[PDB]
Structure formats: structure tokens, C-alpha cells
């Protein structure tokens, strides 16, 4: 009866099916393909446009070999490994030269069995002729002949709020942090900290937060008022989502004391420093404070609401309502694989290829591309 | 011996009972904390004691049938490898796993592994390995044990360094 | 149970002051100059042995969250055997291993603490 | 960082790891584990507002309490009443194949939070789905001994894939963070309803809330460990 | 223990209690600050008895009131008087201290300074709860007996 339940002995068949389709190194392949297919194109478009010269589509050829006393040959693992050649493929850009008062660029090594590698298609009989073993998993790179593997780098997940208690001999007792990161383009790493000065029994436990490019901690009230939220209560509605929790609220009275020296957004923005300072502030609140979410302009509420959320998860931890966050929880950790890894490079490098093409223009009052930067770059 | 495994399987079974009762007692708030200790600390203290005590008497039970022929007993009698703890963990119960001088913590929220319900302080949940190496561990057992044995590897690495330092 | 009140007008915080002529508590906004009378004479409450928080996360769908355990008891009210219990939600060291059941049918909270001090559980 | 944490279950092999030096710092993935690769969050951040997601702009806290807040890749997009209906949607949209199977979603019911992730680099693993939608009986794994012969079928012919199991909602990908909210059964049989003494003692299946079921528990080991015979009758180290 | 004394399970109790550090905190249930202007009658109907009774054989309008757990008290060798006077002589002459007698169904203490009082009455609640020692020696937290 095809509708009957199952036995454990059956789950094994579910497993054959699992592996029959992903092999034992999918983590590798998949990561890489994502880079090629989507991640790369995304990298070319960003700060490409030059002040116009723009870059469009990206094309990736299959493994090639540029050799003296010869023309371009189709490369394969067997030969790369033997002659100590880097097994990479052709990388061409689509440039546009408009004018304001298609093109080769480096080689991209290739993960051995991803979309490109002629082995991702090869059958069994074709592998043998190719002098490659039908049992090789290949999630590696061939560089200067030796096979290089990229080891998964474990980092803490970003864009997540965590609260941690601090050691008894410190002037702070609690903290809320956020590893703000733009999933794409630039990927700044400015972390935000919401500190709670004074321990249990100190006079006036105040709350100040640390903002980037600012040489001092600024009291939450004042940062709220810099975000356009002036009236206490209105501010407190962003922090305490409950008017009966007199305990939390009581804990916030010492915060209101702080900002009892700045009663308007003008001064709220200024305190962080006129004229000069004020624009310096606004900018920071926009593009350098709580960058994930929005770097734009008209989103200063979606942020005030968050800062509050953070101050809330902080106070819960200081009321013994919720435990400190587990730094060792695996779900708040990420593994950067071959794809994201190359990505971190290709950016740094392409950035240069761009910053050079510019310098090529500046000195040429009146095809100028160093393809060596992106090739030697990845290789090294 | 067959009867010995029986006397062991119950020695553990009643050991779990005490753990069960002491829990119901605490859940009713009838537990009176020790001096300087928490109701929570003195609960763990009592529960751990019941399990190690279960592990030891299960062991002596096992150790006892070992004939004078039993090669392992022979190596223990001569004094060349072997010890209660070995026979005890091999032949009878393995024991309570621990890490940082406590039973398996709630790394997951309010729980040990996602195969349990929250606020579960039973022995199965927080690290007790009722089986023996001869009998084999269960998945949940295999993992906690893994967690412990690991702590044993981590500080062994430390104890090695920090000592080599001191010595020099 | 110290509920504080805001200043009408400039929705800011009110602070207590004393009317030495008729002995009564006046809360006055120090942003502008609004002033009003006080509801109660209680200005501060600390609570070293707090009780709020045991009950927490007791929301309408709670019976739908599978991670919670379930025992069949009778709530003092709807004598129904559908309960989902859990230890205190207060995460302190001295908290007790007392349980708190939540009758799924009538949505009432009842404890296993044979010393029930609380009248409103929270 | 070097102790074998609780969450490592089913992702990182509990045993394989270098002795001493890089002990606990260097890990190994378990056979059936994989890693999120990354998806576009925009089409979901949109869907949401189309089913509640009362935009955070006009969130009146003291006028909306029972409402759950919504998160997408760390971002607080808004509030939402009746999340119970919303989640059932998404759940099927991921089992329909309509939402990338990588995306993880967690509802902290008691915490009043619905969190959705599309981040890249989140280790996860597959689990059988047990959702009880059955008139005949009480709760059970959707996969039936019929799906199986239909799998073993495809093996003999060497059209029923693993992906096919994925799109028919027979299996799912659960990462650590979403795991916090599920009740998993170990074996399918022995856990959804005289004793050989010579067999290990196991606890019971006191559960009528099971959401998933392990494909097999031996899938918590990595490559190395998978080659050990009876590693379960062996001392930990 | 002193020579001849080493069996007195009870003498082992005395010393422990004279050694172990005890804080007002360990016995306090909750503190409150009320606006009670007239020191002849309380706005809190429960202290009516305490107030009259305080004349048998200046002050501000702000009241600092503490409630003590009968249990925490009976456990540690503590008495309202012992406690009360201990607080009383920490602030010596410049803080009025009054408390219900051990007999009352509620253990309570009433304080008053002696113009910004709601602040003094707090920096003071902390000094009371933290600094003020009731019985024992500092640093000596736990104390166990052994035979
Ligand atoms: Zn005003
Ligand atoms: Zn009921």
C-alpha cells in the first residue's frame, strides 16, 4: 500500500537519493556557481560608472591558456596539473564609452567541477580519456599545478542583536551589539553598541550608545532627538512597548535626565560635534549608523524604532527577564566559502582596476587596462 | 551474567525514581535549599549524586561476577591496566556526562537538543548515559558524551602547555 | 506599581514637587510650566524579590508552539485536561523550579507551587 | 569557541577534529549538512506587506499589543496581527517550492517574533516533515513507503529525485536558528505509535507535537567518523 | 572552635552567625518612597499602629519605607531592633528611623531625611541596601559547618 507509513530501514533510500544528487562537496560547487552566475555580475555594477565609461554584462569563457610561440589553447585539469598551469577561464567585460566633459580583464581560476569546468558535463567514459578519475569529487582549484582548497571561514553572523553581560571590574554591566553589514555593495562593518553604565546598586544607571566616527558615547535620549523624536514618552514608546511595565520604565527615568539638556533636533544633531558639525551628524545617522535597513534619507523612524528595540532587549537582560545571548550558538554564525571569499577579493581588485582606468584618463589630456591586476590578484 | 544485567537495569531504574521524586518535590516547591546554595543548585547537586551513586553500584555489581578467569579482572588484579571505572563503563553503565562541572546545559533555548521539550531536567535530557560501551550509546547519548570527551581533549591540551611552562 | 504620568501639551515627563501650604503631591513638567495633582502618594517602588516575569510569553497561540511540554491536569476553572506548562520565565539564579500551566481551553494560568502567594500571577 | 556546542547537532561532526592545537577551532561538516548560498529578500519583503506586515512607519505600540514584529535578514520591517495564518502560508510556499528552500523562518511565539533569513553561509540540514494532516491515525511523516519504491525505482534504472522529495513537501532544510522551534523525532518507526535484554535501553516517544523526524541519526557524523565501525560502543575521544 | 568547645553543635552556630556577612538586601522584600507630609498620621493605613505606638516607655515630608521578609529574618539571627538600630547608627544624627516590632504581622521600617529629597531618599536607599552590614564580617560570604 503506497500510502502506508515507513520504517527506519527505508530512510537509507532517502539518503542514496540525497547523495545521488548533491555528492559530498556541494557546499563547494554551489557556493562557487552562485559567485560566477550572480555574485560576479553584481560586483561589476556598483562604483563602475566613472566621472562616462560604464560596465555592462560579464562573460566567462571556459579554461584557456595564453602561451608564447602559440595561440590560445583549451586547458584542462590534467594539463594544468602537469605543466603547473593555473586552470582559469576567460573573463570579458562589456564597456560603454559615452563621453562627459567586448573588453578583456584578468582570468578567473575555476572550481574543478562547477558549471564551467569541462568536467561538469563529461560522462564516465569521457573522464577516462581526459585522464581524470571518475571518482574525483573536485571542489578545488588548480593553481601553478597544485590543487588548492579554500577552507570554510567561520564568522559570527551580522545584522543580529545580541546582549552580553560584562565582567564585574568594568564600568559597564550590559551591552547590546549589532554587526551591521550590507549584504551587497561595499559591505561596511561598523558595529553599534548600546551600553548601560553602572551596575546593580549604582546611582543613576544611564544608557549611552557608541556611534562610529564619533569620539564619545551619546545618551539614547539625545540620539532619539537627533532622529526627530523629541518628547519623552514618544521616545519611551519606542523603547517600552507596554505602559504597565513600571520596572522597565523606572529604569529609563535616569535616561530622560541625561537629555534634559537638549530639547530639540537642532541641538540633538549639533551635540555631536555650528554648521560644520550638524551636517556631519545627519550624514552619520544616515549612512554610518544602523546602515543595514537603509542608508537613504527618509527612513529615520524605521531606525528610531530599532534603536528602541535594542534598548529593550538590553533592559530585559538587566531585569533578569531574559538570559544573556549565547555567543556559541551556531545559528548566529556563518561560514564564508569559496564563493563569498573570492567575492571579497574580486571587489578589492576590481576597485583598483577602476581606480587605475581613471588615472589612465587623468593623465591623458588629448586597451589601457592592466589585466594583470585581476589575474595576479586572484592567483597570489 | 544475565541476572547481573537485571540487577543493574533496575539499580538504574530506581536511581531514576529518586531523580523523579526529587523533581516532583521541587516542582511543588517543597525543596529546601542547602546553606549558601540555590534551590536550583542543591537540586542539581542532589540529582548528580543520585546518578554517580547509581553508576558506582551498577559497576560493583558488574565487577563482582567477573570470574577469576575474566581476563580483564586478571589485568586489574595484577595491576597492569584496568580499573573499576573501566569495567564499570564497559560492562555496566557508562555514566553521567558533564562539562564545566555540570550536566549538559541548555545550549538550545530551555533545552538540550531539539528532540526534547523545554524545561526538561530529567537524566535522559541533561546528560545521563544509562547504557554501557558493550550495549552501545543512543544518538542523544553519543552526542553529550561527545561534548564531554571533548572537554577532556581541550584542557588536556591546556594542562599540557601550562605545565610545560611551569616546569621550565 | 508606580505608574508615572506625562505633561499634557509638551508630552514630556512629570516630576514630583511639594505644596508646603496644603501638604499634597504635585507633579510638574520642568520643560515648560505645566502642573497637576498626583493620583497616589507612591513615588518609588524597588522590589528586590520581584515576581513579574514568571508569567511571560503567555500569548493566545502558546498552545500551538510544539517545544512546550504537556501534562493532563484540571485548572481550577474549566476542569479541562489540555495544559501546556513551563518553569518560571525569570532567568535568575534563585528562581524556583515551580511549574506554570496554561489551560488551553480557558486560557487560565495555574501553578504547582504549593505555596501560591500570587493572586494575579505576574 | 572550541567546545562541542549543542547546536552543532547534525551540522558539524561531533567527533572529527584535530588534536590539541586547533582542537575545536577546526571543524568538519556532517554528511547531510549544506550551506545557504544566498537569495533575493526583496520579493518576500514585498509579499509580507501584502498579507498584514502593517508597516513599521505607523506602528502604535500602545494601540497594537498582541501583534508580532517581523524581521527579514536582521531588518525590522514591521508589525503583524494574526501571524498564525501568515506562517502557514510561507510554510507551504517553501514546500511548494515557491520560497527558496534555503530561506529559514522562525516564529518565537512566546517572544512574539517572526524572523526570516536569506543570508548566505547559514549551515543547515534536511529533516523529514511529520505534519499530522491525517484522518486515519495520529501524526505521521508525509513520506510513505510508496514514495520510497518510487525512489528505489529511480536507482534501479541505473525520474524521482531528491529535489522531487523537496517540492512535494516531504522534506525541508532547517538551520540552527529555525531548529529552536521544532520537535524532532529520532527514528520514524519506534517513535510514532519481552524486550531483548541484549539491546540498548532507549527512552520513549512521549510526543504528540512532533514536527520533524531525523532522516537517520548516524547522519550527525562527518566523513572520517562515518568510517568507524560501532563508534557508539567506543569511548568518546 | 575554642578548645573546650568543639562539640557544641550550637556554638558552631553562634560563630558562623557572627562571621557570615549579612546585608540588609538579603532580608528586604521591597523599598518604597511615599509622599507622607504629616508625621502624625500615615497615608498608608497599615502603619497606623506603628506611628501611634512610637511614644511609649526637623523631619521631611518624604518617606522611605522598607518591608522585610519574616522568613529571611527568623533564619538569620535577626530582629527588627537589631536591624533598625544598625541602620539608625549608620546615619547617626540626621535620619529618623522607625520600625514595627517583631510582634506585628508585617516587618517594616520608615525613614526620613532631616529642596531635592526624592534624590537623597534614593542615594540613601542604595547605601542602605548595599553598604549597610547587619551581622558578620565583609568578604565572608558563605559559611558551612563540618564535623
Ligand atoms: Zn510641558
Ligand atoms: Zn480552564
Swiss-Prot record, chain B:
Sequence similarity: Belongs to the RNA polymerase beta' chain family.
Assembly: Component of the RNA polymerase II (Pol II) complex consisting of 12 subunits. Interacts with DEF1; the interaction is direct and serves to bridge RPB1 to the Elongin complex in a DNA-damaged dependent manner. Interacts with the Elongin subunit ELA1. Interacts with the Elongin subunit ELC1. Interacts with ASK10. Interacts with ESS1. Interacts with RTT103. Interacts with SHE2.
Name of the gene: RPO21
Record PTM text: The tandem 7 residues repeats in the C-terminal domain (CTD) can be highly phosphorylated. The phosphorylation activates Pol II. Phosphorylation occurs mainly at residues 'Ser-2' and 'Ser-5' of the heptapeptide repeat. The phosphorylated form of Pol II appears to carry, on average, one phosphate per repeat. The phosphorylation state is believed to result from the balanced action of site-specific CTD kinases and phosphatases, and a 'CTD code' that specifies the position of Pol II within the transcription cycle has been proposed.
Glycyl lysine isopeptide (Lys-Gly) (interchain with G-Cter in ubiquitin) crosslink location in chain: 24
Domain-related comment: The C-terminal domain (CTD) serves as a platform for assembly of factors that regulate transcription initiation, elongation, termination and mRNA processing.
Spans annotated as Bridging helix: 139-151
Highest taxon of source: Eukaryota
Protein name: DNA-directed RNA polymerase II subunit RPB1
Localization of this protein: Nucleus
From Swiss-Prot, chain C:
A GO molecular-function annotation: nucleic acid binding
Zinc finger intervals, C4-type: 7-32
Gene of this entry: RPB9
GO biological process: maintenance of transcriptional fidelity during transcription elongation by RNA polymerase II; RNA-templated transcription; transcription by RNA polymerase II; transcription elongation by RNA polymerase II; transcription initiation at RNA polymerase II promoter; transcription-coupled nucleotide-excision repair
Keywords assigned: DNA damage, DNA repair, DNA-directed RNA polymerase, Metal-binding, Nucleus, Phosphoprotein, Transcription, Zinc, Zinc-finger
Other information: Present with 2440 molecules/cell in log phase SD medium.
Residues holding Zn(2+) 2: 75, 78, 103, 106
Alphabetized Gene3D superfamilies for the sequence: 2.20.25.10
The name this protein goes by in its record: DNA-directed RNA polymerase II subunit RPB9
Function: DNA-dependent RNA polymerase catalyzes the transcription of DNA into RNA using the four ribonucleoside triphosphates as substrates. Component of RNA polymerase II which synthesizes mRNA precursors and many functional non-coding RNAs. Pol II is the central component of the basal RNA polymerase II transcription machinery. It is composed of mobile elements that move relative to each other. RPB9 is part of the upper jaw surrounding the central large cleft and thought to grab the incoming DNA template. Involved in the regulation of transcription elongation.
Family label: Belongs to the archaeal RpoM/eukaryotic RPA12/RPB9/RPC11 RNA polymerase family.
Major subcellular location class: nucleus
Subcellular location: Nucleus, Nucleolus
Swiss-Prot record, chain D:
Entry similarity comment: Belongs to the RNA polymerase beta chain family.
Note: The binding of ribonucleoside triphosphate to the RNA polymerase II transcribing complex probably involves a two-step mechanism. The initial binding seems to occur at the entry (E) site and involves a magnesium ion coordinated by three conserved aspartate residues of the two largest RNA Pol II subunits. Present with 18700 molecules/cell in log phase SD medium.
Lineage of source species: Eukaryota, Fungi, Dikarya, Ascomycota, Saccharomycotina
Full-protein residues shown: 511 to 765 of 1224
Assembly with partners or alone: Component of the RNA polymerase II (Pol II) complex consisting of 12 subunits.
Domain of life (superkingdom): Eukaryota
Protein name as annotated: DNA-directed RNA polymerase II subunit RPB2
Organism whose genome encodes this protein: Saccharomyces cerevisiae (strain ATCC 204508 / S288c) (Baker's yeast)
Coiled coil: none
Subcellular locations according to the entry: Nucleus
The encoding gene: RPB2
Function: DNA-dependent RNA polymerase catalyzes the transcription of DNA into RNA using the four ribonucleoside triphosphates as substrates. Second largest component of RNA polymerases II which synthesizes mRNA precursors and many functional non-coding RNAs. Proposed to contribute to the polymerase catalytic activity and forms the polymerase active center together with the largest subunit. Pol II is the central component of the basal RNA polymerase II transcription machinery.
Curated annotation (Swiss-Prot), chain E:
Post-translational modifications: The tandem 7 residues repeats in the C-terminal domain (CTD) can be highly phosphorylated. The phosphorylation activates Pol II. Phosphorylation occurs mainly at residues 'Ser-2' and 'Ser-5' of the heptapeptide repeat. The phosphorylated form of Pol II appears to carry, on average, one phosphate per repeat. The phosphorylation state is believed to result from the balanced action of site-specific CTD kinases and phosphatases, and a 'CTD code' that specifies the position of Pol II within the transcription cycle has been proposed.
Subcellular location: Nucleus
Disulfide cysteine pairs (residue numbers): none
Domain of life: Eukaryota
Further comment found in the protein's record: Mutagenesis experiments demonstrate that the minimum viable CTD contains eight consensus Y-S-P-T-S-P-[A-S-N-G] heptapeptide repeats. Identical and simultaneous substitutions in a number of consecutive repeats are lethal: 'Ser-2' -> 'Ala-2' (14 repeats), 'Ser-5' -> 'Ala-5' (15 repeats), '2-Ser-Pro-Thr-Ser-5'-> '2-Ala-Pro-Thr-Ala-5' (10 repeats), 'Ser-2'-> 'Glu-2' (15 repeats), 'Ser-5' -> 'Glu-5' (12 repeats), '2-Ser-Pro-3' -> '2-Pro-Ser-3' (15 repeats) and 'Tyr-1' -> 'Phe-1' (12 repeats).
Domain observations: The C-terminal domain (CTD) serves as a platform for assembly of factors that regulate transcription initiation, elongation, termination and mRNA processing.
Protein name as annotated: DNA-directed RNA polymerase II subunit RPB1
